[PDB]
Amino acid sequence: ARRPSRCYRFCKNKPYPKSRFCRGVPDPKIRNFDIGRRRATVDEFPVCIHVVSRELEQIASEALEAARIQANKYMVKRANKDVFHMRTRAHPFHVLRINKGMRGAFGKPNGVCARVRIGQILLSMRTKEAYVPQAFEALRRAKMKFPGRQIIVMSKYWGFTNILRTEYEALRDAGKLEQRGTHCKLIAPK
RNA sequence: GCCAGAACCAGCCCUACUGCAUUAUCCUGUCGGGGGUCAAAAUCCGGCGGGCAAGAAGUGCAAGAAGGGUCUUGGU
RNA sequence: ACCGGCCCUCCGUGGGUUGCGUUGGAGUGUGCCUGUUUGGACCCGAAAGGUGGUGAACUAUGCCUGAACAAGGUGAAGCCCGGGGAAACCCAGGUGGAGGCCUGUAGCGAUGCUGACGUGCAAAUCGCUCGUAUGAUUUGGGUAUCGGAGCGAAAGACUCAUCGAACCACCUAGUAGCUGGUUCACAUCGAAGUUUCCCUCAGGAUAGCUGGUGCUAGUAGAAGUAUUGUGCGGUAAAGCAAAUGAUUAGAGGCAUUGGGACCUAUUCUCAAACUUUAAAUGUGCAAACAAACCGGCCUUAGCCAACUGCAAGGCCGGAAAGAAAAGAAUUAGAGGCACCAAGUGGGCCUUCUUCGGUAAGCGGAGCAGGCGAUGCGGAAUGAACCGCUUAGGGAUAUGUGGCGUCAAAACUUAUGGGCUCAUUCUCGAUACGUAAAGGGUGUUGGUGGAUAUCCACCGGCCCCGAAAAUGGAUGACGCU
RNA sequence: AUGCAUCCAAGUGGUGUAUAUCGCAAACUGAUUUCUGCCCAGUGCUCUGUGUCAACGUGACGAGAUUCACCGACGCGCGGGUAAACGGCGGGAGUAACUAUGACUCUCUUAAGGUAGCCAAAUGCCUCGUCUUCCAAUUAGAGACGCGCAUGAAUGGAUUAAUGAGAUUCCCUCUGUCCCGAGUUACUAUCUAGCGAAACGACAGUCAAGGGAACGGACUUGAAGGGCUAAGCGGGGAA
RNA sequence: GGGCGGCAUAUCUGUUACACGACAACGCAGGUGUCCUAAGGCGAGCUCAGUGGGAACAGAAAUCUCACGUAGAACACAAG
RNA sequence: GGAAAUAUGAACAAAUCAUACCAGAGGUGUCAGAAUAAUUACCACAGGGAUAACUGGCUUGUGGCGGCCAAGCGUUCAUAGCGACGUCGCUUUUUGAUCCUUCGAUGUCGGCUCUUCCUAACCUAGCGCCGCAGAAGACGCUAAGGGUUGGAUUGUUCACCCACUGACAGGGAACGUGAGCUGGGUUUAGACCGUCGUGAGACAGGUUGGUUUUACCCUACUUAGCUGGAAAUUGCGAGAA
RNA sequence: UGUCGAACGGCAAGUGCCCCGAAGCCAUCGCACGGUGGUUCUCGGCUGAACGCCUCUAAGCCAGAAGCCAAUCCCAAGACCAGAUGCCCAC
RNA sequence: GAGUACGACCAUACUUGAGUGAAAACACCAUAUCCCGUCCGAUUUGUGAAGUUAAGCACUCACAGGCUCAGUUAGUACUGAGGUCAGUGAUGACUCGGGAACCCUGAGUGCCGUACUC
């Protein structure tokens, strides 16, 4: 039985990653950071729905999996597996310790958490404009696996790109837009 | 050389009596366009004609040489 | 420059030093306080160590000579008679009185009640029960063995209520960095829990803070502050599209390969021990009176090929907003020395930064301020919070906090606006200061959509979530 | 005995020794019965005598002191003996015609690898071992089995009749131990006459909550409280 | 708490450490008691790590050659 | 005796020998530098709450008890009853951590006795709801008024079975309660065993034997007496349910 | 059993012992007795809107737990009773 | 308007790829008897002067990479002082001050000194 998340919710220490100094750190519980059609293109899924953190806290890697194993569930239950793409924009890079205030008290690594901030995006699921209301409900359920307070906002940008939903058309049709991968870059003069 | 009361000096502490500037996104006058009403006055917006809203403003600064205290000091 | 020591040398009108040296003496005797030191050493206090004597009337053991041990049971050897047998020998009835034998008095012990008593009858006793009671038995008198020794059927037991080293006197008022105590008043000043070293960590010495004495030409060689000029920095932030360390993912480069390697541009996400860049807060120096500034002169075995240049120490003369104007400083700003010596060297709390920890009224740091050591006015109460800091008193006015009663003040103020209803720890209510996720067609505002009605969101108060051991707490009553 | 152990400051000193190996002195174990296994490497003792070990003695250099050289015994070195001296007495891996099991084999290591026995024993961590018995039910008891944390042979092993104020368990009788208490007696307490202390004692003495050196008799806010007595009693006074 | 354990008992680089300096903990990450007649001193010449194109035996790796190569090498050692 | 020859052994002089002055080396790792093994359960002294073992405090990892989300379980189905992955918490009957209070002493376990409290309700009173036909029962609500046993083994809290019952709920009060008891157990001195130690001895290993002292004081509580006082003693201070 | 010489009467043995024993005390070891009203929680409802219908709730009502509060029961005026009374005194 | 030698700052000067280059000078270039040094006349040393601007050098040109400089990001991040501020808290705003960084965008792409020379 692991120690509860009540013990590690607050950013009380400096960031303590895996380096050439701390070398017994376990494998974090989240391994897949993208669910859905990650092979897909930019103009496949226009809309973007975020899960933004309203707290300065540490989310454990055990909660990043629990929020992602369950957001995948309600999507394939109430849609297909080929309409969404939920990127998890938090990575467990800070390593927690356990003393398993006494002589020789500096702990050993047992778990890894994500030091998240105010306004830092936690989840991001780009979907189609048809199947939007199934995505507000998959992300309402996924933030229950999260500590702290989160909001589910509607992003004004076209998917995972840095270009607006107002100003995406006549920018691929003006030809000025470099679509590489899952993101875009406005071509400028060199 | 005790206890009270008033009086009057001086000192000090209170509170009455107020001027200089400032108004304008404002005052007033009528023709509009707007309103509502039984009809129409108003709220509201706009033309150019006048302006001082005059213990008029709760806006800036105030220097206006007293009636009351003084078992809140000293004196005769 | 000279004196002494030690040297170097190019041998000097030369270098380097060292002394508790010299450069027109400051000693010395005494009185008195202070401090260090040693003596009983401010007072009282160990466990101990040593010397020499007294004890075997308690009790441990040996020896000499005396004394003591009811009444029962069991019944050993030997002895007598009978019987069986060929013999070897067996079998029976008595007799007898053996034993570290048995029951049980006295005596000698002391098992259980964990009885009584437990400021007793008693510094070990009383009661009943129990062990033994012809033996390694009990006991008198006499004798013999003792203090690092005696004696011990051995328990470190006993040696005159004293024993894992007796008792007496002494050395000895042993020594204590440890505990306790330390006797009049007022006045003037007033700390430290930190540094370094220590067989040091409950102690010291040392520097600091502190007092006393002063000395020296009362603004001087001043400053926990600014301003202007000129230096130093790598923390916060930023970045990973820049090196290093991590770390997701898609895009194809096509021949660069094997059952994403590889390459090129991007990307999601990070770094106390990473960094291109880089703050705020800090930190160094300068800002005209022994000083720099301006034009010659003297000197030097300094430098340079040389001096007319350079470097150095003087000399002579000059100028000097005594530092302008540009926001262009301010000062309850006498500067500089020295002697002597206390107490302290357990700290603790807090805003902020921070480390270990799940956490802690936890442990450890940084800058400052506090308590310690300090009340007073407030937070009902509280070392540390808020206000304020303190001679003995008045008057006025405040601060923090208050104005329904307790309790001074709105004798429950306004001729201000909203919000709130809560039915067994009972809505709520003075910061520090000790319930959450989540939910509500309770009410009250907002935002964005739609056809007077719906829909998604967000806020305020209120309710649910919300369960402990004396009766109970916004401080009490109460207040709507 | 020209001794052994030993007193002893000392001597022609003292004890066992008034003795004389059927004795005296020093140890161990603990009646009988039955046995007492292996280990002499370690550490002790002990025995037979050429490395090294002091003083003395010897010789030499030198003016001599000082040096140097040689000789130099016990004792350790070297070799034996000794366990009823102190003590000690192993680890892996495979193997039988069903499985298991392992007579069997292999390997490593030792001074020797624990023999006869005994056992969850007063010695067993796991452990309230497992099996059987005893009870309606037993972490207890007895008998077993031993994979013995860590049993084991005069550091004595095993066993035993008789004996024990020894430790344990069951059964019978028995009962106020209990269900569940009652009632009587003597002596107290209690009341009087006479007599008359001690322990103790800052001051004192009602509580709830709050705070506080984080369990208040005193402080804060509440709740009680007329004074003074006699017998009790054991919650507080961190008595 | 003391004991065992350890060394935080003399000492070095990074970090903690809060952009001067100074700053604690049985705080974090590692070192130290040695080593060298050259691994010291100096002068000259040279360029390293690595990758790419090539050359009998000869391959991913032997050695020759060329190019690129701000140090990605090296400087006895821990680190800077 | 100087610019220049090292100096002393103090009545002198020579030669030996020692010494001195200068610069190193041989070493103190506890590194500003004494030359150091245990044991004590036979124990002592001065102290320390500067510091441990018992309670109290803080914390709550750990131990107990929940809610929120809903992948799943339930033939069907998220929630009758459950509910992973997460997550937010309550609790102080566990334990750890700490070291605040006590070392010129707070008697350190469990029984026995007795009273009270709390609710997170086992039985009893009303209920709602079920994958509730009845009968038994799951879950929940208001409620702590009342009740909650007899035993075998164990020193036990605990555990474990036997049996009765409507039911044999869980806790608090200095782990309630030793001038209330008991003393089984921990927790001395004796002795035995095993393992350890060369030994003296050691042992959160087993075994056996091992003084439980004081109330007459203040309060509290239980009963038992006496006796004033409305300005709660006085003012004469005048209030009639 | 001892002892007043024996009988009689007794006495001693901390009440010698044995049997029966009044009275008193006492046993779940016997016997008798142990009662009413409301309030309102959960809850189920009634009217009834907000919200032209619906709805236990928002106003308002109903029924209602071994809880709670009274009645009964026990102490009782320091709860200071001009509650009532008997008899004396004093105004 | 340029060269060469010594240079100061040390990319606005570097890197890559093209283009152009009067004179003179630098430079490739020729060579090995001496001086000298190599496995090698490659480098290096000496001695030269037939050849060529092919290359170095110089200059010019890239919606070049870089570098440099403003601007933007942005009064944003962060931070000094304050509160009986708000919030269960995490933290946030306010008040008095200071005030970034990358991305991005624009610009231009060496400059000054001595001696000798065309």
Ligand SMILES: NC[C@@H]1O[C@H](O[C@H]2[C@@H](O)[C@H](O[C@@H]3[C@@H](O)[C@H](N)C[C@H](N)[C@H]3O[C@H]3O[C@H](CO)[C@@H](O)[C@H](O)[C@H]3N)O[C@@H]2CO)[C@H](N)[C@@H](O)[C@@H]1O
């Ligand atoms: N010298 C006298 C002898 O006594 C003899 O008398 C003896 C016999 O009669 C008889 O002897 C008996 C006998 O009965 C029988 N057969 C044999 C038995 N052993 C004997 O028994 C004898 O000896 C035994 C010992 O064993 C004893 O115990 C006992 O005293 C005695 N009776 O007992 C007598 C001994 O006491 C004869 N008369 C005879 O031979 C002769 O006279």
Ligand SMILES: NC[C@@H]1O[C@H](O[C@H]2[C@@H](O)[C@H](O[C@@H]3[C@@H](O)[C@H](N)C[C@H](N)[C@H]3O[C@H]3O[C@H](CO)[C@@H](O)[C@H](O)[C@H]3N)O[C@@H]2CO)[C@H](N)[C@@H](O)[C@@H]1O
């Ligand atoms: N010790 C070495 C010599 O022995 C000698 O004495 C020796 C003998 O003379 C003497 O032995 C004699 C014995 O022989 C003769 N029969 C009579 C005498 N009683 C013994 O003496 C004995 O008695 C007493 C015990 O009380 C012991 O102390 C002693 O040792 C013992 N040996 O015992 C000694 C043995 O060593 C001398 N005393 C003297 O020279 C020296 O001591």
Ligand SMILES: NC[C@@H]1O[C@H](O[C@H]2[C@@H](O)[C@H](O[C@@H]3[C@@H](O)[C@H](N)C[C@H](N)[C@H]3O[C@H]3O[C@H](CO)[C@@H](O)[C@H](O)[C@H]3N)O[C@@H]2CO)[C@H](N)[C@@H](O)[C@@H]1O
């Ligand atoms: N003489 C010795 C010989 O070896 C044998 O000795 C054997 C055992 O005694 C001994 O083994 C041990 C022993 O060391 C230890 N001390 C006791 C243990 N119980 C024995 O265990 C032996 O006995 C038990 C029970 O009988 C068996 O179940 C077991 O299998 C066996 N190993 O080692 C040997 C292994 O079997 C015989 N006992 C003996 O009869 C034979 O003669």
Ligand SMILES: [Mg+2]
């Ligand atoms: Mg007998």
Ligand SMILES: [Mg+2]
């Ligand atoms: Mg002993």
Ligand SMILES: [Mg+2]
């Ligand atoms: Mg103060």
Ligand SMILES: [Mg+2]
């Ligand atoms: Mg006996």
